[model samples]
Target: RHIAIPAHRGLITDRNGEPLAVSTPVTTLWANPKELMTAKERWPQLAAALGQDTKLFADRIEQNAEREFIYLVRGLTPEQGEGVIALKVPGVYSIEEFRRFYPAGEVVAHAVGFTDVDDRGREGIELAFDEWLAGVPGKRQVLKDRRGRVIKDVQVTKNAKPGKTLALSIDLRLQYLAHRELRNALLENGAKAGSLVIMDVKTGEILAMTNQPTYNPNNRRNLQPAAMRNRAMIDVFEPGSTVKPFSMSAALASGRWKPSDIVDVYPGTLQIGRYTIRDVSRNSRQLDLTGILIKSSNVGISKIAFDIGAESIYSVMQQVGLGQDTGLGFPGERVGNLPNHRKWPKAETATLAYGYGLSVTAIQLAHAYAALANDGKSVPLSMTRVDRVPDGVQVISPEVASTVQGMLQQVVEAQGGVFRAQVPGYHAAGKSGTARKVSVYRSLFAGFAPATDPRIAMVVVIDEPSKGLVSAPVFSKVMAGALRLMNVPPDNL
Candidate 1:
């Protein structure tokens, strides 16, 4: 019912001027059925030359004029175009057209998305900016020579404007760098899958995002659902100790507790109603808010949460950017569950204090820490350049945020909990997370760099790591590599 040609579309580029998506002129072989005098005579040769059955080629030619235009190929490179033209085959003609191209390929596949066979956006940027990435159709009136060839000088009519350029905030260089290490880490850790993302804490610009098991957008024949899913934004898991720092933030932001305020973590176990919470490190002692995060004390945080009260704790969680969609405009950004105080069971409060009762996506977790780095302000997580930056709401007091930063730093420095997460030149601060993976357990490390003046924040989640260490060493190696590439020095080291 609809006749379409290859409508040209403009390209997409990164902030660094790297090409993400592009379209180039090419040749498509079409046939004029009305002009085929003897498909029967040429059928065998056409079959052999084009690798199509004789009957199929004949049948296709018969439908061309009835359909007005029938294309044998959508995109043909110059070599293929020349080779096909050299054959001088009957009823076989080359039409000038355009084919979408992605130079960064798999590196930007999850972000830029791709156009389908019908020139429609199917995923990522292609899906998000479908109207902008897809252009209106154009028409070309043909001029034929005596031999039924399209005249080389044929003119186009009703030309369509190419789609506007789509620019992304992703830095392809950083993207490649992150992907390089993340993919290798996945293999080294024997993890079923892995994802690494870098976001500018101040602007929330996603400078880099990469996941293993990606594919070339140029070729979709082997795409798997795993390759298509953006794990950082789409997948959810319990945050484990990674949520400890945020839980402390919630407690401090309420004005009910200070970083130096001590909580009596009795015997490393505390009973709230019927639920008992214990510290993983099993340190039975009094802990200030700083001690709670530095030691990742489960009992400490649970006790602190009770002091702040559930309503205020939950409000801080919402304010620090949890239990809500990141609004990054990516497809399927999950708003993980956060139980209201009234509905939350007594044990759930204790569990929630330690990040066990709550569920969140890696992106949410990263963004939460980013709010920490941003001194309590929450910027709109962006993958594209913004004409105006969003004024992030302050979720915590400056004193509370600075106090939490110091506490997070202690985790890397003294405990060596995430010693591997440290950078060499600047003050790099981070936290390591080990949670029970479904069926088994998963390991995660999400942190930001140059601990003092945090510029780049990263999140690395390894699913079903086969090794015993949960690959903390791999996280350290990758984070260090990224820091070096960013020219950041570890002041803490």
Candidate 2:
């Protein structure tokens, strides 16, 4: 009377055609309740074949007596299915089905996502592109006797269509590279969680994105919901000093400040109301705009923001993709927090200049850095491979972007910047951020490598790290591998 058919779900592969998610043929064992119960003597053998107790198996069939058909087991291995068939239990039969598999396991779990038992997309890219990856099922008419036994051949009314393969922008090599490094960082720093996003500066395609405390998509046994989240897009944090470059850009955009303009950061503390903003571990002295970034001066940036005003600083922040979705259309991607300029307190306004009072997801932060690397034009971020590079919106003049880029370069040099953030053979540049949470610290580094002509823009955020460690080392480790894999020529050479 009826026949159920299966439609193969599409294969999900990396940019290089390496399979990340695939569906394998499996067997489902189902039974006709009436037929099953009639052969009471065979119940023990059928139960044994299915690795179940005889009484429990009989109780299950008895409970579903009113139903004509019930699923005994799904996703049985071929050998197990053959063993069940070998038992020849009346009314018990195996049907061809499919089960999803993740070859990369937890390495790309957050990026590729996992499917439910029925092969339906559940999270991550699986849920994001469900319709395209899940194909249409077909139906057929079958002739069955009154006892629910098929007697005649069925005619196919419709043919199932296989889902089209999805080519993601993720590079597997880089994904593994990030995964290994992030995991090490998390373990070494005693951090609870972390996120990393690597992007192609010119194309806006995500090369690799990973999160620590991940779960294996293959076996979801005892998987916690917290581990399944793609933190790179969903979680937000105060960017801390990483936001200073944009503040510098806003000041430069305003005609008043030059790169060489000096700001008095004497004692490295400024009083706004009763609150005293101080630069951590810094000397009180006059420093230029470049010096402010190289030293990561909270006082200097605060003065720059106060002079430029909140509106100008806020406008540049918005242009750099903060406070908005990165256009990936990922499930549960957060827009992050950016308070209105009118609502900012005097203290908040100044802190905002050096990356506080606002928040950003790792992808949003990377997208903003990519904009700066692309000469101040913002391109839409993509999870799938893009054929033609899209036109970018001009966020700031090229001159301002170059000026900020130059300043960031100094933050990696041996003379004044975070020396650990530097790559040995390339001109690396970036900003390090350390934000204090209620009880722990969030360490971060956002930058691009081979500074002369940047190819990759990345962000690394470590949550709740130990006192001595920071995010720059993690950034340096991940960026070095990514650059080598992408084959970007060394700028310093």
Using all chains and alpha carbons, the TM-scores for the candidates as numbered come to 0.89, 0.95
Superposed on all Cα atoms, the candidates' RMSDs to the truth, in angstroms, are 3.2, 2.0
Query: Per-residue lDDT tens digits of candidate 2, residues 3-113?
Result: 566789999999999999898999888887877878899998888888888888989999998776788998899898899999888778667889999999999999899
User: Residue by residue across 364-384, what tens digits does model 1's lDDT show?
Assistant: 877888888887777878878
- Model 1 segments beyond 4 Å from truth? 1-3, 38-49, 62-69, 141-157, 341-345, 387-390, 415-417, 437-440, 467-471, 489-493
CA lDDT of each prediction against the hidden true structure: 0.73, 0.86
TM-score of 1: 0.89
Off by over 4 Å in 2: 1-3, 63-66, 140-142, 146-148, 152-158, 343-345, 467-469
Q: Candidate 2: deviation at residue 377, Å?
A: 1.7
